[PDB]
Amino acid sequence: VNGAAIVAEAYKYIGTPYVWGGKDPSGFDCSGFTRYVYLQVTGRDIGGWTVPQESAGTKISVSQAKAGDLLFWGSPGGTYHVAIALGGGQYIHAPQPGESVKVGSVQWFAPDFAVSM
């Protein structure tokens, strides 16, 4: 149950199309994807939407994010996006209604804070 396992589970759903409110491999939104990964690996249910997922661990800087941690866009209480940290400025996410689950870099779109799990 290390972050490597979270990353390995998240990689299984690359190419899953975006579906608003989707919570399973037929379609994910940003929060549904992270919730599903953590449900598969740990069995516990972090929030179904973005803001409850801000409580699942301890807040931390994006620099101090290891593989498996959660990354949040927006301010605490008003986060609008989440991804799973891959380490080294990389993450994996359900990006937006346009796109399917894919990898991304903080050099493209930088998250605002992170959460250790």
Author numbering: 414 to 530
Copy out sentences from the published article reporting this entry, exactly as the authors wrote them.
These results demonstrated that SagA-NlpC/p60 encodes cysteine endopeptidase activity that prefers crosslinked peptidoglycan fragments and cleaves the peptide bond between D-iGln and L-Lys. Collectively, our results suggest that E. faecium and its secreted peptidoglycan hydrolase SagA generates small muropeptides that activate NOD2, which triggers downstream signaling pathways to enhance intestinal barrier function and host immunity.
Gel-filtration analysis revealed that SagA-NlpC/p60 is monomeric and amenable to crystallization (Supplementary Results). The structure of the SagA-NlpC/p60 domain was solved to 2.4 Å resolution by using X-ray crystallography. The SagA-NlpC/p60 domain contained the typical features of the cysteine peptidase fold, a central six-stranded, antiparallel β-sheet flanked by three surrounding α-helices. The overall dimensions of the structure were about 32.5 × 30×23 Å and shared significant structural homology to other NlpC/p60 hydrolase domains. The root-mean-square deviations between superimposed Cα atoms was a range of 1.6 ~ 2.0 Å when comparing with NlpC/p60 hydrolase domains of other structures. The conserved catalytic triad (C443, H494 and H506) of the SagA-NlpC/p60 domain was located in a putative substrate-binding groove between the subdomains in the α2 and β3–β4, where electron density for these key amino acid residues were well observed. An electrostatic potential analysis of the SagA-NlpC/p60 domain showed that the putative substrate-binding groove was mostly composed of negatively charged amino acid residues. Structural alignments with other homologs also showed similar conformations of the catalytic triad in the active site to that of the YkfC from Bacillus cereus, NpPCP from Nostoc punctiforme, AvPCP from Anabaena variabilis, CwlT from Staphylococcus aureus, Spr from Escherichia coli, RipA from Mycobacterium tuberculosis, and LysM from Thermus thermophilus active sites. Indeed, single and double Ala mutants of W433 and W462 significantly abrogated hydrolytic activity of SagA-NlpC/p60 domain.
